[PDB]
Amino acid sequence: DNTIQWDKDADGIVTLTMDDPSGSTNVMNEAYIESMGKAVDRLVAEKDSITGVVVASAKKTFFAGGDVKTMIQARPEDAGDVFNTVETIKRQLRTLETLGKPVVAAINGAALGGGLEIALACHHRIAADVKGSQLGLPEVTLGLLPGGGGVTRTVRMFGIQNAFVSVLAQGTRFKPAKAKEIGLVDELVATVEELVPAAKAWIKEELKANPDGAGVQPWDKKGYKMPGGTPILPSFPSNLRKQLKGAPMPAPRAILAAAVEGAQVDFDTASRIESRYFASLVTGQVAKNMMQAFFFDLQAINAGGSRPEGIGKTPIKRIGVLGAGMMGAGIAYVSAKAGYEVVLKDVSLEAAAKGKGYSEKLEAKALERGRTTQERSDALLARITPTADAADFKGVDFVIEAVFENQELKHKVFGEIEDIVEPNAILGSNTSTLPITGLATGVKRQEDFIGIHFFSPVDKMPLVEIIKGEKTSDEALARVFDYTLAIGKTPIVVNDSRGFFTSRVIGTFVNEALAMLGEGVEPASIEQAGSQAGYPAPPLQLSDELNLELMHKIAVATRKGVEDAGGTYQPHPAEAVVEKMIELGRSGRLKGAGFYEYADGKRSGLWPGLRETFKSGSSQPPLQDMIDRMLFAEALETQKCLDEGVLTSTADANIGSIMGIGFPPWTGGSAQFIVGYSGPAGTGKAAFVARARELAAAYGDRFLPPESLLS
Numbered sequence: 001d002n003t004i005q006w007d008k009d010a011d012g013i014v015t016l017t018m019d020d021p022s023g024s025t026n027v028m029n030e031a032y033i034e035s036m037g038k039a040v041d042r043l044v045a046e047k048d049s050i051t052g053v054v055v056a057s058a059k060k061t062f063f064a065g066g067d068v069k070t071m072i073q074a075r076p077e078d079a080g081d082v083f084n085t086v087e088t089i090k091r092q093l094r095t096l097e098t099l100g101k102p103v104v105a106a107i108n109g110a111a112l113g114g115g116l117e118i119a120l121a122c123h124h125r126i127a128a129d130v131k132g133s134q135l136g137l138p139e140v141t142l143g144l145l146p147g148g149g150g151v152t153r154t155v156r157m158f159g160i161q162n163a164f165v166s167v168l169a170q171g172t173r174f175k176p177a178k179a180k181e182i183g184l185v186d187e188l189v190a191t192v193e194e195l196v197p198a199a200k201a202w203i204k205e206e207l208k209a210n211p212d213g214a215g216v217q218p219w220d221k222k223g224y225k226m227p228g229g230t231p232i233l234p235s236f237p238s239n240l241r242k243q244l245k246g247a248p249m250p251a252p253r254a255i256l257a258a259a260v261e262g263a264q265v266d267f268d269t270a271s272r273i274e275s276r277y278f279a280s281l282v283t284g285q286v287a288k289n290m291m292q293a294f295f296f297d298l299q300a301i302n303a304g305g306s307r308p309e310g311i312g313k314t315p316i317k318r319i320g321v322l323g324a325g326m327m328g329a330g331i332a333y334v335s336a337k338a339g340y341e342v343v344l345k346d347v348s349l350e351a352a353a354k355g356k357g358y359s360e361k362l363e364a365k366a367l368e369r370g371r372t373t374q375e376r377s378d379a380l381l382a383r384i385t386p387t388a389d390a391a392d393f394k395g396v397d398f399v400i401e402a403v404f405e406n407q408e409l410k411h412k413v414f415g416e417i418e419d420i421v422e423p424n425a426i427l428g429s430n431t432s433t434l435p436i437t438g439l440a441t442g443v444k445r446q447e448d449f450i451g452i453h454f455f456s457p458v459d460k461m462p463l464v465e466i467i468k469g470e471k472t473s474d475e476a477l478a479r480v481f482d483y484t485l486a487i488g489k490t491p492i493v494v495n496d497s498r499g500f501f502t503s504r505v506i507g508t509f510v511n512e513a514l515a516m517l518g519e520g521v522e523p524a525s526i527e528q529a530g531s532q533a534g535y536p537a538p539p540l541q542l543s544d545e546l547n548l549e550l551m552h553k554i555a556v557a558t559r560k561g562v563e564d565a566g567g568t569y570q571p572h573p574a575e576a577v578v579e580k581m582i583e584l585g586r587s588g589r590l591k592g593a594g595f596y597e598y599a600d601g602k603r604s605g606l607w608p609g610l611r612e613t614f615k616s617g618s619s620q621p622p623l624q625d626m627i628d629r630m631l632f633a634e635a636l637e638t639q640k641c642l643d644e645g646v647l648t649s650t651a652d653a654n655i656g657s658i659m660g661i662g663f664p665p666w667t668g669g670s671a672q673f674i675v676g677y678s679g680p681a682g683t684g685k686a687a688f689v690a691r692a693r694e695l696a697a698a699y700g701d702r703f704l705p706p707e708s709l710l711s
């Protein structure tokens with residue numbers, strides 16, 4: 001069905017209104033391509049009676065972008081048909097661009113991806129200043145690239161350097177004021193009522209001030225020189241050139257390829273180069289992994305996928321944090337970012353006041369960077385009130401414990417506070433591994449007790465792992481689910497079990513690298529395989545952040561938990577490496593020494609005496625084997641959480657692995673890595689199963705795939 005209504009006044013200015021009936025948002029589906037074709041074909045058939053075009057929308061947004069439902073189904077053999085589709089898109093925008101008549105975009109809200117590309121094919125872009133309006137080309141975050149002329153036009157507008165670093169490489173979303181300054185928007189208006197009138201007025205004015213250049217883009221005139229001069233030069237871009245190697249993620253380098261190759265030719269050939277690289281990424285497996293995680297899975301979580309279905313909102317009044325530390329003091333800051341009053345408690349009043357001081361050091365740094373205002377700085381600190389008296393906790397309807405990880409201590413910390421807080425107060429616990437059901441026995445109201453696991457530093461980490469105990473009510477689960485969306489963080493819901501999900505899966509990752517070291521692998525190759533696999537932090541570097549002595553008793557609870565069941569326990573080969581590192585007095589960053597040497601709180605080089613300790617060099621496995629040993633460990637462990645019921649959806653698994661433990665984004669998550677694996681022996685789950693058995697026959701039975709993956 002049609003998606004664009006045709007409006008023409010007496011002056012001769014046609015108004016194309018993009019009103020897609022099949023949804024609330026205009027999106028580059030097959031229906032739009034049908035409409036824009038017949039709408040651009042009419043502007044050429046009535047060329048003699050039209051003196052200008054206006055492109056508007058009838059939604060709260062302008063245009064949302066490409067049809068991700070169809071792009072994620074694009075098989076590699078569809079590469080040729082995909083090339084023809086985007087060519088048809090750009091041919092319509094190129095004809096509209098060269099009518100010889102002015103064309104103005106009346107941007108009335110969000111204009112993303114395909115939407116900004118439509119507006120870039122215009123000669124003038126008027127945008128409103130409405131709260132929530134965003135503009136940009138964010139398809140790089142999905143492993144794609146601006147294929148509707150976004151790459152070709154932005155390079156012609158700002159040159160290779162500016163267009164790539166600002167808009168294309170990172171897919172930055174802009175507010176209309178920031179979009180006008182960089183050159184993405186030519187004029188601003190107050191409200192949407194005056195968007196269309198200001199467009200026709202600008203057309204009337206341009207038709208007499210620039211009667212020859214009207215409708216002629218700056219890069220179609222005779223003497224055109226691209227800004228920055230026409231053209232592998234990865235030295236001028238910023239220090240974020242780790243994405244330009246294109247090794248795990250091919251999208252950033254492919255964009256730079258289409259840009260640099262498109263600057264040496266004319267506009268029409270530059271466009272076709274853009275189309276060739278677009279069909280290359282779209283039909284790839286990396287783009288499907290990213291389309292799955294950072295579009296489908298994210299929206300499913302922010303739409304309440306894990307949240308219980310029939311619970312309403314319970315507004316929060318006052319919050320209480322039991323224990324101010326690296327997490328407790330950070331918990332107070334993120335909560336005080338919103339209008340939530342925060343009461344902080346610790347052992348002594350100075351220990352509670354010290355926790356607030358750390359929250360003030362972040363605001364002082366933000367003032368030096370001009371992030372917010374001074375009146376907003378004093379108002380934020382006016383919501384944090386540290387104390388050592390429990391009477392201040394009276395009136396708190398949301399408790400977040402963050403004391404020392406001690407079971408009999410947390411039963412005492414709540415025993416002091418459960419009678420003084422509100423009868424409907426949430427008894428939230430922030431524990432790394434202690435079972436929630438074993439912690440709720442210390443409070444009277446077990447139905448309101450719940451686990452709320454943050455990640456340090458709290459101000460930076462966007463994930464909150466909500467752990468549900470056996471007694472936890474679904475209403476308290478929803479009240480925490482809403483609190484997470486209020487602090488700007490993403491929630492996942494986990495059933496109570498030893499290791500939860502985020503610490504259990506990251507354990508198999510750090511235990512795999514420590515295993516190789518005990519087997520006799522060069523410590524440089526372990527960090528190389530980690531970096532090449534796409535982990536933001538190499539595993540030995542991550543093993544010094546998490547304390548080794550903290551990881552010691554993690555291996556003591558598991559051993560005695562299997563022996564209590566009357567069975568023989570099988571130790572992980574990494575356990576011997578930990579005990580060896582503990583014998584040598586190197587326990588991690590906190591102690592000041594670990595796999596890396598540390599000085600003044602910074603990370604120096606790897607420990608020189610490490611190679612002699614583990615006879616490094618005796619084991620030299622293939623680099624892909626090392627890469628796949630760490631990835632398959634997390635993917636198999638994630639699968640066993642879905643079997644045991646620790647997780648209830650792959651979307652939580654995928655988003656949990658990415659935003660929580662640093663799983664490589666190109667995999668799309670630890671669950672997606674099973675259905676999206678690709679090796680020299682195939683793609684998909686069967687190929688994942690075959691590769692798993694290959695690693696198993698060589699290294700150990702821990703790589704054997706569970707039954708749920710077989711048939």
Ligand SMILES: NC(=O)c1ccc[n+]([C@@H]2O[C@H](COP(=O)([O-])OP(=O)(O)OC[C@H]3O[C@@H](n4cnc5c(N)ncnc54)[C@H](O)[C@@H]3O)[C@@H](O)[C@H]2O)c1
Nearest residue numbers: 323324325326327328346347402403404405430431432456
């Ligand atoms: N530290 C992390 O990065 C991290 C990450 C994930 C989970 N966790 C877990 O969540 C919690 C986070 O604590 P942390 O590591 O940020 O803090 P920390 O261990 O550095 O300090 C804990 C604080 O609790 C205070 N405290 C002790 N007894 C108290 C009492 N009776 N009442 C009130 N306060 C008391 C201490 O004085 C101290 O300020 C711990 O349970 C931890 O195991 C920690």
